[PDB]
Amino acid sequence: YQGETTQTLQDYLMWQVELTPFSDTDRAIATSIVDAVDETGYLTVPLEDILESIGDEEIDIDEVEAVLKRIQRFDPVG
Amino acid sequence: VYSYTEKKRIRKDFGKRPQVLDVPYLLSIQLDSFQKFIEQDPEGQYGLEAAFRSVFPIQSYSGNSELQYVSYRLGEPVFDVQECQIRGVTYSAPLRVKLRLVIYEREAPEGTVKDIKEQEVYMGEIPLMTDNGTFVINGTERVIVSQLHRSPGVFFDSDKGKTHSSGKVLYNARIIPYRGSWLDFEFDPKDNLFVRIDRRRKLPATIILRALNYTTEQILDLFFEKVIFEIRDNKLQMELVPERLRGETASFDIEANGKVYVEKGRRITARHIRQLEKDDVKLIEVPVEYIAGKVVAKDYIDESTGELICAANMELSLDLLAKLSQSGHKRIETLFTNDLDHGPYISETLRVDPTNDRLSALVEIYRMMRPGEPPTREAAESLFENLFFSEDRYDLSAVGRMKFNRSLLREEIEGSGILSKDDIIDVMKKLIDIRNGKGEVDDIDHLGNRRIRSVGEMAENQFRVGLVRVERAVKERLSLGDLDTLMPQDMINAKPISAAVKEFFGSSQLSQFMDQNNPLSEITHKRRISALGPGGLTRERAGFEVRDVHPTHYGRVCPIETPEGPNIGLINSLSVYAQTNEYGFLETPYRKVTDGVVTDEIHYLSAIEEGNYVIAQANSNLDEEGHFVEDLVTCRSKGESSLFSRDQVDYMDVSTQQVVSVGASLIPFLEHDDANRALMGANMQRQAVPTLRADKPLVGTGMERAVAVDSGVTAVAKRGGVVQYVDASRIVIKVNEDEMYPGEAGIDIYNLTKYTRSNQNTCINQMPCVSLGEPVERGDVLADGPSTDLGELALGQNMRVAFMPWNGYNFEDSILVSERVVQEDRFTTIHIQELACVSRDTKLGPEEITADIPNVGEAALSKLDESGIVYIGAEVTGGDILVGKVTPKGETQLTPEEKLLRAIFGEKASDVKDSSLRVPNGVSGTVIDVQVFTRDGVEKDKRALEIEEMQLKQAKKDLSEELQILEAGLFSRIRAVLVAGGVEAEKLDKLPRDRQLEQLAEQYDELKHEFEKKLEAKRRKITQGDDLAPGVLKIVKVYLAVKRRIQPGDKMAGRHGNKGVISKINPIEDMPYDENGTPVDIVLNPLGVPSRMNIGQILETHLGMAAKGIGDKINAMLKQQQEVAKLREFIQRAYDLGADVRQKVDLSTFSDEEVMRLAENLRKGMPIATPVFDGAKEAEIKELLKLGDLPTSGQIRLYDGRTGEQFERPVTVGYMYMLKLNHLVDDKMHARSTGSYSLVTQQPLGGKAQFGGQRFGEMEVWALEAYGAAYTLQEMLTVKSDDVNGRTKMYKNIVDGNHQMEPGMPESFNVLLKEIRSLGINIELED
Amino acid sequence: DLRPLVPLDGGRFATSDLNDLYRRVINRNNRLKRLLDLAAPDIIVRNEKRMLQEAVDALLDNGRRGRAITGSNKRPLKSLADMIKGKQGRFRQNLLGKRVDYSGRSVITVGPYLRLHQCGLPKKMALELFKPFIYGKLELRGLATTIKAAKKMVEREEAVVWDILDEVIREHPVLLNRAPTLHRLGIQAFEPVLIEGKAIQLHPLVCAAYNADFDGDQMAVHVPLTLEAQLEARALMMSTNNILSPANGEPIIVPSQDVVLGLYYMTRDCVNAKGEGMVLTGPKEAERLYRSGLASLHARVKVRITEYEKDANGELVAKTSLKDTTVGRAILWMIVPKGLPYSIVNQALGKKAISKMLNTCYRILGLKPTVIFADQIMYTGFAYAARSGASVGIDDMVIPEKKHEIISEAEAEVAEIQEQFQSGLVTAGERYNKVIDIWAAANDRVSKAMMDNLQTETVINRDGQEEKQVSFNSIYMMADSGARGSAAQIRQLAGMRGLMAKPDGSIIETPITANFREGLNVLQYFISTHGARKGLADTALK
Amino acid sequence: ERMGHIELASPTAHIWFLKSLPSRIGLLLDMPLRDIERVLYFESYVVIE
DNA sequence: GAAATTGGCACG
DNA sequence: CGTGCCAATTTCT
Ligand SMILES: [Mg+2]
């Protein structure tokens, strides 16, 4: 016996994050945004915790909101 | 005289040889085997009696108490076969054994028992065989295959002479018991005899002989003949037997009676032997040089000293001779050991033998058996006595004893089941005799040396295997003294016996799912002989000699029906007339010939007896009483065919088809087919799926009816009567008055099987073939089955075929098919598939099946009823929901966001998940059946009550019919009696039916009570719950049925090994046509006949055209209404055609409405029967082609459908019988781009149901390395298969329009490194 | 994660083999530690150390020192060594050969309309194999503005995804492979053509290389992804690149069975065929006469043929002359490319006279003319084989009239020698050898008589007299042209089958004197089974 | 990727370097395989120094 | 089952 | 002490 790899919600979200024309910083932000999504699809942390997880001084909350508004229209919508 | 079923459509028979023996019941082997196991036997053997008597009485270790055995009994099954199949349980019977416990008195073993207690005890359930030779185990029918193994006994078989480089032949023997340890005797290149026990290390042959309490003197007495030298006052005079000098050259001077008969250097001739015999010469004086190497027989001791002059069995010398002669000894015993005939083997073995005692031999055997433990005298003696001389560990069974005695040329057939000294001595003597030159080795492939073991014997063996463990448990428990309290029910436990019995029938190797895509597949699976399995050969080590046709297969095993592949010659099939005698050896019938006239007497001869007689052939002519026409007949004598005289014959073959099996006797014109193609045809004929409508072969062999009836797929009337009710799902027959039991309402009710699923996901469906109010008799069919037409086997369709090349669309076995074949749905099949939804019990509450799934919309729930199960008749597809199931998620603490979510959308949406059953991807069909199983205690929903109401609606119908008949009879009697006692005519009619008479009216009230009790008894079983599993609440099964049409890629075939794949579906106006404009259904390639040499498919084509030519005349006489006087005249002309045929059909005994009914069935072509090796000659096909006006050549001229111009040469058109094999292109096509990967080695999974990828193995890597394709090979090793980080990059690049890869490293080499370095080996990548 | 537990329905985490072998070792080690701490007597600690040694040995390599420990089903547990080595180990199952993506398989059928650089691929298999390409092409031209929109469009199979598929499969080779891959010609690259159905259509001429026939075979298709794989499949593995066998250097694209039958039937002559002796002005007039029905395909005529030959520099010079040929050869001359002589088709073309024609074309002209010539040869052969209306009947197997006389003479001789042995003149072995010789001579006599009767026929001449010509028998044409069949099969069809051999190998003296047009009785059919089972088992085991 | 280790309470011989026919331990110590097996599996003693 | 290598014993 | 034959063991379809 070996097993089989099932596709969860975060794997599906990453499959679309990698196929979206982001930038190097936008994809790093999207990784944190997708990581903090529970099984019901709701963001579990404030955007101030994602801006802190990025670990960059020049990124502002506007970019995080812009990336979140794009991630929010993936499949499933909402 | 014909039966009612055969009189509807009589198949014309071209056979010309009368039959004397009719084909037996084909499934007789399985039933006869199992009946021995089940039935009670007054003697111990043959069944459960043997198993019980081979263990009981079970007694304690000198506890003076034992368990006895009285008898056994089998109870009644709870459910019959159909209930066990629809319910998913086993059809078995409970076993009740009357056990008895006796308690004697201490110190008085002979004293009367102080207490006896007897009580029948349940010892598990044993599965029962149905009336068709199959077992249902878990709702599914299974078949236990017979086995062909080596018979127990002694077999002498030398090596071929290859082991030794010099080429010396090494002879050996072997004793094989039914249950025990082996025993081998063998020779070495040094010509000494050696013994091998249980295939262990080799030992000298005299170890066992000394362990049997023998001394050297008596050993030499047994194995040698004595010559006594007499010292008559000088120089070692000798007693002479003239025969001893045979094949000897004298090295000294032989002289007697004053005459030197033999000089020095003269070899004795036969003339000298005759002269010595005439003169009776006995005394010869020899010099001392003759005894320089002669061996002394016994021990000689000096009379003075009393010590040992010389030990036994060593050669004498001159000094030793002087020493033994100076001590006053007169007789010297020597062993006649001439090197040619009476060879010195055991004496010289004694020299190599280390021990010369009786007690150290047991020590040596104990060392050989169990090494590295101290040898104890008692332990060694017990081991030796338990090896071959204990009834509880060694069993040379009755077959083994018979073979042993008959091989040793004994007289008694029956004896004991344990070896003795005499048996081993005889085996050694026979081996030495074979070495000396009078004796032959056996062949282990003779069918007189191989035995048939069937289901009953194996079941008995497994039952004994369980019983011995039960016996061990009883013996261990009975040591404790509590006799006055316990009863026999407490001692034994039914779990081991039941477990062993169920493991034999459930998960053995010879117990397999029944092949159920034909009646022929079933009837040839039940009649199968397998050389594999537990106790038999192995596929890899089988060899080359067990896979060949032996001359003893004639009439016992079919030679042209065996799978082609890894196991060819190991899974052979039983013949038609073959049987098994009381010992399990196959035997075949023969017709006795006395004084050169065949006397119709049938004797069943086995392979051993068959070789003694001279047996004639089935194709030998005899003249009206039995007299061979030619005085130089053909016969088989001793396994070699040869030509014998007229008066030397002893037997004759009973039929011309007793050499071939059932499957190979359904091929017309078999004698015109190459033996390589007949095998393929017979193998492919049993994997043809049943089509929508059955079609008779129209060219057959006459074996269709036997296969159709014996395999229980039809509905055969149990008793004769008149059909009183006909329906698409039931038949009610009113039995005759002279076939009814006393006090019985005579009706037979047959419930037909409608659209049930078989083991191969095909359709099983029975349709009636009788009409309302027509007579029936016992034994004729009432309803057809899958692939059956009026009680005749029908596996395919009759296609109008032509042999010609057509623009390359029938190139290299391809088939070109017309469009009308697809329009008429001739090869359309129905496939049924089941799905299951199980609702289990979790810790956070149980799962429930409900129609309101929280997240899905109102459209997906459109085809679900109030109970959440799909409607019957709904056409599902893709991912439709079949069963609405919900599993509970709970124990989540409330939060303000969770409360806000729960308030707006309701509490039902929350705390529940969705686990509903959905149709898989790519699966479609129509819901035709839903089955609900509910564990007892759980409350049934509305659907599971509706199903039960439907089930109850039918038993009420049956009981109502019986009650109606009985009430009508009783009320008629009441009215008649009351009219006799007071005449009333009309006042009774208006009076209510309620109004000696008291006794008659009591019977009505009793009958009502009885038929009310029966209905309650049936309801109490209809409403009974199930026992599903630990933690399972409900199971819902849904069946989907889909119709598969024909298309390019589907595989079709024929009965002569001519398979093919459809390549095109050609429109009608493109197919070739003849003068009348009739197109051709199928076009075949003529370049397949000359090389394959299956000429039978062309004779079948011509005969089918001739047969359709008669139907085309009958149809033409029927369309324009003709008087019956012409119809019966033409049909009689058709049935009279032939050259000395055996069939006689006269239509003057047929009424007009029977001639019309026959001619209505004969309007699609007259069926024709051509038996194998006794078929229709070529000169009679041409008479049939002239009866209906057709060309004699069998070839007509064809026109091109596209250009309209005639083909330059005549082509062969006709009607051939085509099958649709179960290799559909719908189940073959597969594709994959990206899916799910494995876990440990992240590579794509394998298979079609897992959406797996194609394996790119080693041989395909070699082909890419030979081309020079390095990038194509690198992308199939890392990016497309295994490199985890490269798969996503490649996918992203392909979607981005950039075709470039970053190779990376496979993920299955890191696993290799981690597994190598977990063995303590430091492997690493460097630099 | 390399030794995971198996989750099966019912909440059961069944322990695997490696975890069992680790738990055993850990239990023994903990027991030994506790016993050594307690200062137990030396007997118990020695037993514990021995059992720990046995447990470690079973973990590292189970069963190497006898008595492999078994699981529930009495089957030995798999250790690390069993996972590394063997046919089921890492090396031979996951590293030297793997399962791959972008791959499918299905049953192969025949397409006679193809060119040998293209194959027929179902349009429902190519939609799955080429899916990321379809996504990229869909969202490249604005049909889908997101990956999920293209995913939905492909999922519901709209009417434009088929145009997208036809655009993306235009020039993109696919590798077709059939197992077993015995040599490098078992994997070849073709250009797809989208067909309707579920079966792959394979070009006929490439069937010899694959050793594939259409009676249930299946093939696997793989898609080259990168830009170097698409050029390796086009310049190295393409089907039009390998037309010579790498083993010996001979062509591997020879027409096989009913491509040579049509070319044999077309290129033949008859003594008094319709419209013979007339003078034609070229191949076009010959075809116009044949189609119009004014002349036969075998009529001997005179036609004006122009043929080109290469000079020293390589230029083509033409020569025109009147050839004595047939109508069928003039029609075939329209296919031969320029630069080849007319004597290459002015004969009856069997199977060896067609392969040498392609070899000559390859050696004189090149690779492209050879490919075009092979395709045209296949087309013409198929067309005229279909047009000929050839068939096979039961009257095409002409039994010689002298067969029974030969058999009777042989029987008389064997009876005479049987009596001679009965008189004691000869030994049993000598009698056996002489009987075998007699039957071997009778078989040859029957075969020669049958073949002399079969291979010729009579025909009325141009005038009233008669003449003799080669037979137009359907079976004789298949055997003589090399289409299919040989001499031995025709001998078994129309002459005695001959001497058979027992499984040991010794010849049975009494032969099978019956062919397949006649029947074999029960005893004559039981020895051919010995032979057939030997033959089948040999292949099945080799 | 992360491995672990078990601290054996007593030394244990590697079976690969013992039971492979060119016995690496036997060839190094110049002892027959039977002697090494009997010492390892606690059936006999051996003198060291 | 066949074949190659290794340890044990008869022999010179 | 030094060679060669024979039984055991292993690995491979
Ligand atoms: Mg094939």
Curated annotation (Swiss-Prot), chain A:
Highest taxon listed in the record's lineage: Bacteria
Entry's family note: Belongs to the sigma-54 factor family.
Role according to the record: Sigma factors are initiation factors that promote the attachment of RNA polymerase to specific initiation sites and are then released. This sigma factor is responsible for the expression of enzymes involved in arginine catabolism. The open complex (sigma-54 and core RNA polymerase) serves as the receptor for the receipt of the melting signal from the remotely bound activator protein GlnG(NtrC).
Protein name: RNA polymerase sigma-54 factor
Source organism: Escherichia coli (strain K12)
Source species taxonomy: Bacteria, Pseudomonadati, Pseudomonadota, Gammaproteobacteria, Enterobacterales
Section of the entire sequence shown: 112 to 189 of 477
Curated annotation (Swiss-Prot), chain B:
Any one Gene Ontology cellular component term annotated for this protein: cytosolic DNA-directed RNA polymerase complex
One Gene Ontology biological process: cellular response to cell envelope stress
Phenotype upon changing residue 664 to E: Resistant to antibiotics salinamide A and B
Reaction(s) this enzyme catalyzes, per UniProt: RNA(n) + a ribonucleoside 5'-triphosphate = RNA(n+1) + diphosphate
Applications: Co-administration of salinamide and rifampicin or salinamide and myxopyronin suppresses the emergence of resistance to both antibiotics.
Domain of life per record: Bacteria
Keyword Lipid metabolism found: no
UniProt entry tagged with the keyword Transferase: yes
Enzyme Commission number(s): 2.7.7.6
Pfam families attached to this UniProt entry: RNA_pol_Rpb2_1, RNA_pol_Rpb2_2, RNA_pol_Rpb2_3, RNA_pol_Rpb2_45, RNA_pol_Rpb2_6, RNA_pol_Rpb2_7
Post-translational changes noted in the entry: Acetylated on several lysine residues in the presence of glucose.
Alphabetically ordered keywords of this record: Acetylation, Antibiotic resistance, DNA-directed RNA polymerase, Nucleotidyltransferase, Transcription, Transferase
CDD domains named in the record: RNA_pol_B_RPB2
GO molecular function, one term: DNA binding
Subunit and interaction comment: The RNAP catalytic core consists of 2 alpha, 1 beta, 1 beta' and 1 omega subunit. When a sigma factor is associated with the core the holoenzyme is formed, which can initiate transcription. The rRNA transcription and antitermination complex (rrnTAC) consists of RNAP, NusA, NusB, NusE (rpsJ), NusG, SubB, ribosomal protein S4, DNA and precursor rRNA; S4 is more flexible than other subunits. In pull-down experiments interacts with CedA.
Purpose: DNA-dependent RNA polymerase (RNAP) catalyzes the transcription of DNA into RNA using the four ribonucleoside triphosphates as substrates. Resistance to the antibiotics salinamide A, salinamide B, rifampicin, streptolydigin, CBR703, myxopyronin, and lipiarmycin can result from mutations in this protein.
PANTHER family membership: DNA-DIRECTED RNA POLYMERASE I SUBUNIT 2 (PTHR20856)
Family from the record: Belongs to the RNA polymerase beta chain family.
Protein name: DNA-directed RNA polymerase subunit beta
Organism of origin: Escherichia coli (strain K12)
From Swiss-Prot, chain C:
Effect of residue 501 to E: Resistant to antibiotics salinamide A and B
Sites where the protein binds Mg(2+): 213, 215, 217
Family: Belongs to the RNA polymerase beta' chain family.
Name recorded for this polypeptide: DNA-directed RNA polymerase subunit beta'
Application notes: Co-administration of salinamide and rifampicin or salinamide and myxopyronin suppresses the emergence of resistance to both antibiotics.
Source species, domain of life: Bacteria
Whole sequence portion shown: 248 to 789 of 1407
Subunit structure: The RNAP catalytic core consists of 2 alpha, 1 beta, 1 beta' and 1 omega subunit. When a sigma factor is associated with the core the holoenzyme is formed, which can initiate transcription. The rRNA transcription and antitermination complex (rrnTAC) consists of RNAP, NusA, NusB, NusE (rpsJ), NusG, SubB, ribosomal protein S4, DNA and precursor rRNA; S4 is more flexible than other subunits.
Annotated phenotype, changing residue 536 to R: Resistant to antibiotics salinamide A and B
Effect of residue 511 to S/T: Resistant to antibiotics salinamide A and B
Source organism: Escherichia coli (strain K12)
Record's function text: DNA-dependent RNA polymerase (RNAP) catalyzes the transcription of DNA into RNA using the four ribonucleoside triphosphates as substrates. Resistance to the antibiotics salinamide A, salinamide B, rifampicin, streptolydigin, CBR703, myxopyronin, and lipiarmycin can result from mutations in this protein.
Post-translational modification: Acetylated on several lysine residues in the presence of glucose.
